[PDB]
């Protein structure tokens, strides 16, 4: 009776050569969370799907993916 489903069915030179490099392809979740509670106080709470597909994050002191990150640096 009750049914839930998720389907994701699908100098440098490239001479006649296929490349995919950085790429998120298939993410099926079908999540179910009854009676969910979240109480964040000055932090970071992540309870969902995330798909980061960066290719170049060149840079000193940088951050590529800052999920659920809590940065409290001092001096």
Residue numbers in the entry: 12 to 21, 36 to 100
Reported in the publication:
Mutations and multiplications in the SNCA gene, encoding alpha-synuclein (aSyn), are associated with familial forms of Parkinson’s disease (PD). aSyn, an intrinsically disordered protein, has been a significant focus of neuroscience research not only due to its central role in PD and related synucleinopathies, but also because of its abundance and function in the nervous system. aSyn is primarily concentrated in the presynaptic terminals of neurons, but is also present in other cellular compartments including the nucleus, and is thought to interact with membranes adopting helical conformations and tetrameric structures. In pathological conditions, aSyn is thought to misfold and accumulate, forming pathological aggregates that disrupt cellular homeostasis, in a process that may ultimately cause neuronal cell death. A central pathological hallmark in PD and other synucleinopathies is the accumulation of aSyn into insoluble aggregates.
Consistently, our group has recently described the novel variant G14R, that is associated with an atypical, rapidly progressive phenotype and widespread neuronal loss in combination with frontotemporal lobar degeneration-associated aSyn pathology. Interestingly, the effects of the K58N mutation are opposite to those we recently reported for the G14R mutation, which strongly favors 1PF forms. Altogether, these results indicate that the main effect of these mutations in fibril architecture is the modulation of the WT conformational landscape, favoring either 1PF (G14R) or 2PF (K58N) forms.
